[PDB]
Amino acid sequence: AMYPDVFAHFKDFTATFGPLDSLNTRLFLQGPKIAEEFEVELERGKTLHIKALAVSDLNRAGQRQVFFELNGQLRSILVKDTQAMKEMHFHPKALKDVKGQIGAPMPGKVIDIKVVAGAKVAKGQPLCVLSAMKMETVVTSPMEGTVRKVHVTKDMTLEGDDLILEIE
Amino acid sequence: AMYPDVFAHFKDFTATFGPLDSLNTRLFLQGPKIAEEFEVELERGKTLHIKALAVSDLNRAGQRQVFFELNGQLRSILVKDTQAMKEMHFHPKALKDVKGQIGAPMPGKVIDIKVVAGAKVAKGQPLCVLSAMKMETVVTSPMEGTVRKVHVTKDMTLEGDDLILEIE
Amino acid sequence: LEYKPIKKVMVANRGEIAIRVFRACTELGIRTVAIYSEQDTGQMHRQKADEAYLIGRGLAPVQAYLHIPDIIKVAKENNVDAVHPGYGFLSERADFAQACQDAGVRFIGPSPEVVRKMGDKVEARAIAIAAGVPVVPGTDAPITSLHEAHEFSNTYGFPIIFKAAYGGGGRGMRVVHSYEELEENYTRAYSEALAAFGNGALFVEKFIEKPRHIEVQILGDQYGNILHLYERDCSIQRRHQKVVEIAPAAHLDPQLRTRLTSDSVKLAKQVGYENAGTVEFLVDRHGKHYFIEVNSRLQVEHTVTEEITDVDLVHAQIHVAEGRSLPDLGLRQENIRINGCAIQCRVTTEDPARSFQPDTGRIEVFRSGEGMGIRLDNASAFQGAVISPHYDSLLVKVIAHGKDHPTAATKMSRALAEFRVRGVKTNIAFLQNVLNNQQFLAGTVDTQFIDENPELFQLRPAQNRAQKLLHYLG
Amino acid sequence: EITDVDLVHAQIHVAEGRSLPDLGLRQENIRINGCAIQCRVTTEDPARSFQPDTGRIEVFRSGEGMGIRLDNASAFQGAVISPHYDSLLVKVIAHGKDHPTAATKMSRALAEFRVRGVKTNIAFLQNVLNNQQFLAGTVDTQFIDENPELFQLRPAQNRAQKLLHYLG
Ligand SMILES: CC(=O)SCCNC(=O)CCNC(=O)[C@H](O)C(C)(C)COP(=O)(O)OP(=O)(O)OC[C@H]1O[C@@H](n2cnc3c(N)ncnc32)[C@H](O)[C@@H]1OP(=O)(O)O
Ligand SMILES: CC(=O)SCCNC(=O)CCNC(=O)[C@H](O)C(C)(C)COP(=O)(O)OP(=O)(O)OC[C@H]1O[C@@H](n2cnc3c(N)ncnc32)[C@H](O)[C@@H]1OP(=O)(O)O
C-alpha cells in the first residue's frame, strides 16, 4: 500500500537471486576474490563455506562458466555476460503478451511447414511439426491472418517459445 | 645396447606422461585449444573425446590447476608450473640415495626431537618422536655420526622425506 | 543338452538396460561390445563396455538404432556371438530377429515365429479363445461402419471404448457414454485414426468401471519347461502410462492368484514360448479377470520382481541362450519364495504441474540417496549432464525394498528426500505427494485413482537459496 | 541384511522405552536369508607396509547393481583425505543367495569402481577374492601369514590419467 511498484520489484529480486542481507558487505558490493575462501551464515544451523575456482571464456553467445567450490564439492553455473557484445544476430523470442503471436509450447526443431508463404490458414489446421520426446504437436491459428515471410524459416535449430509466425 | 642413455631417458618419459603417438599433430607439439573439441584414438577397441574448459591461476608454490572434461564427465588436474623457479621456498629435500640427508618416510608433524646438533649420540637409539593417524612411530638411529647444522627445529609441517638433520 | 559357449555379446539399445546387461555379462566373464549414435556420444553406456562403435552416421537420431543392416555389419565383423535387444527399440520387430538368425548371430529371446504370432491383436484374440483364459467381450474384426458401432452398442452395453490397432500410441483411446456422445466420438476417433496413422482398424470393447490389471512374469527354456516368477501390481495409472509399481498383490485372494498362475502357465505352454515372457491381465471388482495382451520382451518393471524372489533374470536369459535347462540352474517352483515388499518409482524430467510436459536442460548438481534397502540404477545422471530433447526422459530408476508396504513407502520417501537434482525440472514432488496419500498406504487402489484426486497436485515450492545465492555471486 | 532387521531403528525404539514384542521382534520370528560379504576400502599402500597414503582424489565413480549396497562416507569428486583421522573411503556390501555368487558380485563391483589420484588397495582385495581356498569356504587366522603372494601379485596399468597430464 505504501509502495506498490517497489514492493513487486523487491519481491522479484529475492525470488530470483535468493535471500540477500546475509552476505558480507564487501561480498555484497565487490564480490568474492579468486582463490580466497570465505563463509556465509544462513540460519542457526545452516553454515556455508564458498571458494571460487576459475572463470572460463565466452563460449558462443556471451555466456561464461564459473566453477564454485561450495563446501567439499564443485558447482558449475552459467551467467549471461552484458559488457560483452550485445548486438542480437540470433532468432528473436516470441512475445507472450500478444496471444495472437505464435510460440512453441515445447522445445524442438521444425521439420516441415504445412503452409508456404502466401496461403490462407484456418482454425484447427496443422501448421508445423515440433519435436518432443516421442510426441508431435501441430499449432492451431487463433486468428486468420496473412503470411508474408516465415520468421522460423525452415530446418533450423530453434528452442521453445520462439516466433514462427506473426500477423500484422 | 646401442644407445643406453637415451633409451633410459625415453623409457621414463613414456611412463610419467603415458603412451604417445596416438595424438593429433596439434596436440603433440602445440597442445589443445580452449573451447574446441578434439579426438584421441587410443586403441582399436575404444575411443574418447576431450574438451578443455579453463585454466586457473597460480595458487601455492607454482601448482596451477586445469579443468578438462573426459567423455561424459568433468575432470580436474594439478600441474606443476616449472616456469617460475625464482622463489626460494626452503623446505630442504632429503634424498634417500644420500646417507647424510635424513628424511621422514611418512609426512606429518614432528612431535619431539631428542638430539641436539653437534653433540654425542648413540648408535641405534631413539632420536625423534613421530605422530601417525592413530599410532606412535619411533625412529631408530641407522648409523653413528655427527650432525653439522639443523635448519628446521620444531613445530612446523613437513612432507615425506624432508631434510631436518644431516648425518656425517 | 546342446551347449554353445558365448564369447562376447553386443547390445542394441541405450540407457539403463544396456548398463544392466553389461554388468550381468561382466559378472560372467564375457566380453562386451557396445554401439552408439553420433548425437548420443556423451552417454555413460558406451563407457562401461569394452568395445564401442559408431552407427547411423547420417541417419536421424531416433532411427539410428533402427538400421538392421548396419547393426548386422558391425556384429559380423567383430566376431560377435549373441545380441541382446533389450526393450523399446527392436524387441517387437520380427525382421530383425530373422536377419540375426540369417547371419549366424544368436538372438536372445523367443523365436521370430512366436514374436509374429504375438504381433497384432486379432491373432492374440483368437489364441486366447481357442486355448486360454476368458477375454473382455468385444469385436474381433476391426470396425469401420456406423451400423457396426450402433449394433454392438445396442447388444452388450452402453459404455464402450474405442481402441486403435496397428499402433502403439494412446491417441486412439476414447470413451463413450451415450448415443449423442457415441456418434461424435466415433467420428473424431475414426478421423484421427485414419489421419495420424495408416489403416484405421478401430476396436469396440466394453469399459470396466474400476479396472485393476495384474502382470505375471513368465520364464521358459528350450526344453518345454516354463517357470512363472509371480504377479505384480501397477494400478497407479496416470492415464495409460505406468508411473509406480508394487510387486506383491495388495489385496488379492490366494485362489485368484493361483488361477492367474495356472492360466498364464497354460497360455505359455500352448504357444510354446522360449524366453522372458510377460502376461497382462485385468480383474474386476466382483473378482472376474479378463485377458488383455502378452508382451514378448523383458519388461522395465522386472527389477521389482527380481528382488522379492532374489532371482537374476538376465543371468537366466543368457543361460537359456547358451541352451542350459532350468533344472541344471537350480530354478524350480518349490525353490522360489516371497520375501518382503518392494516399490518402484521412475524419476523423469516431466513437469507434473502443467501437463507433464517434458523439460530439457543441463543438470547442475546431482547427489545419490543410497541407504539400507535402496537399490539404484543410474541411467544417465552426473554433474554437467545434458538431457536430450529427442530421446526418452528417464533420469534414475529408484527401487526401495522393505519387510512391509508401509516400511517400504517410508524408506522410499526418505530416499527421495535425500536426492537433490537442482536446475533440471523434475517430478519428485508429485511422487512424494503420491507416497504420502493415505489411500496408497491403505492398499486398495484403482486405475482412476489419480483421475479423482485433483488435490494430489500439492506442487510444493523450494526456497532453493543455495543455487540462488551463487547466481548472484556469479 | 541376512535378517533384514534395521538395527538403528530398534536401538532408537528401545531407547524410547518400547518393548521388543510391541516392535514385533521374537527369536522365533527372524530367519536366515542368503549370504553377505563386506569389504573396507582404504587408502593403504598394499605393497610397502600397508602404510597410509594421503593426497587428493581426482576421479571417483561408483558401482550399484542387484545385490550391492553402498555407504559413501567421505568419497566424492575432488575430495582431500586428511592424515589425522581414520582412512576409510567407502564401505561396500554385497548380498547374494550363495557365498560364491556374492563373492563374484563383489569382485564385479570392485572392478567397476574407479579411484584415481590416491593409491589404494582394490588389487589386494581382488587377489583375496580370486583365491580358490577363500572361495572354498574355510580360512584361518594365519591365512594371510602363510600366503606371501597376495601382496606381491598386483596388476597396474594406470594409462588414461597420464595422458591428461601431458596435455596440461
Ligand atoms: C540424512 C538423511 O538421509 S536425511 C535427508 C533429508 N533431509 C535433508 O537433506 C536435510 C537438509 N536440508 C536440505 O537440504 C534442504 O533444506 C531441504 C531438503 C529441506 C529443502 O530446502 P531447499 O529450499 O531446497 O534449500 P535451502 O534453501 O534450505 O538450501 C539448501 C542448501 O543449504 C546447504 N545446506 C543444507 N543443509 C545444510 C546443513 N545441515 N549445513 C550446512 N549447509 C546446509 C546446502 O548447500 C543445500 O544445498 P542442497 O539443496 O544442494 O543440499
Ligand atoms: C558394465 C560393468 O559393470 S563392467 C565394468 C568393468 N569393466 C570396465 O569398466 C570396462 C572398461 N575398461 C576400463 O575402464 C579400463 O580399460 C580397465 C578397467 C580395463 C583398466 O584399464 P586402465 O589401464 O586402468 O585404463 P586404460 O588405459 O584402458 O584407459 C581407460 C580410460 O579409457 C576410456 N574408456 C574406457 N572404456 C571405454 C570405452 N568403452 N569407450 C570409450 N572410452 C573408454 C575412459 O576415459 C577410461 O578412463 P577410466 O579409467 O576413468 O574409465
Ligand SMILES: Nc1ncnc2c1ncn2[C@@H]1O[C@H](COP(=O)(O)OP(=O)(O)OP(=O)(O)O)[C@@H](O)[C@H]1O
Ligand atoms: N476394456 C478396458 N477397460 C478399461 N481399461 C482398459 C480396457 N482396455 C484397455 N484399458 C486400459 O489400457 C491399458 C492396456 O493398454 P493396451 O492393452 O492398449 O496396451 P499398450 O500397448 O501399452 O497401450 P497404448 O497403445 O496406449 O500404449 C489397461 O491397463 C487400461 O488402463
